[PDB]
């Protein structure tokens, strides 16, 4: 088994299950996480809030819709009619 040859890079962290958590069209209850992120890949829109961890959660019950903000930025919305 070789001998003394050793490497200084065998380390990593535990991945965080970030990304999307709900899709456009489904009924989310209020509080449902829609998109765990870092920084702002998606800003909150209508009836959506920003956690301390940049998490996005619905304010109220309703359907979820991802949309465009300006040219290079996206937001999230929730609408209650159900």
């Amino acid at each position: 088994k070789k001998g003394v040859s050793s490497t200084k890079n065998g380390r990593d962290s535990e991945s965080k299950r970030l990304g999307a958590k709900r899709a456009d069209g489904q009924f989310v209850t209020g509080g449902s996480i829609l998109y765990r992120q870092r920084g702002t890949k998606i800003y909150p829109g209508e009836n959506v809030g920003r956690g301390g961890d940049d998490t996005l959660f619905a304010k109220i019950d309703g359907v979820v819709k991802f949309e465009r903000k300006g040219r290079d930025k996206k937001q999230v919305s929730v609408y209650a009619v159900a």
Binding site: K1, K2, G3, S5, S6, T7
Partner: protein, 137 residues
């Protein structure tokens, strides 16, 4: 045309050698050119051999342009070692080529002299080649 003066990451994943030339498929600087028809590596040492042959055969005549630069480093493990224990150290610098990638360009010299020079370069080189002129029309 030997080695990159500095690279960020010195130990790198080896290059893909399957597909077609992303670019450099045309004679732009010189008049005649030499393209490749298979796809091997070029090790910063066979092109050195080739430019010497051409340049010294033209007797310091017309100009030459090398179109391939050895960017990728490659590693070789030390002799008689087992598998594992890290990645080896850099042994040379390479530049993958593709069928259709022009390699060498020449100008300011007659056609037959250029063809002879590129022929002599072709044999110091590990890839099948082809003689081409500045595309026009």
């Amino acid at each position: 045309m030997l080695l990159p003066k500095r690279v960020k990451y010195r130990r790198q994943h080896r290059p893909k050698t399957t597909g077609r030339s992303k670019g450099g498929n045309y004679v732009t600087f010189g008049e005649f050119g030499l393209q490749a028809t298979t796809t091997s590596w070029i090790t910063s040492r066979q092109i050195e051999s080739a430019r010497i042959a051409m340049t010294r055969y033209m007797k310091r005549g017309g100009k030459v342009w090398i179109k391939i630069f050895p960017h990728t480093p490659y590693t070789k493990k030390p002799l008689e070692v087992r598998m594992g224990a890290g990645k080896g150290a850099v042994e040379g610098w390479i530049a993958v080529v593709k069928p259709g990638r022009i390699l060498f360009e020449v100008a300011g010299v007659s056609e037959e002299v250029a063809r002879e020079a590129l022929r002599l370069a072709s044999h110091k080189l590990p890839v099948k080649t082809k003689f081409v002129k500045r595309e026009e029309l």
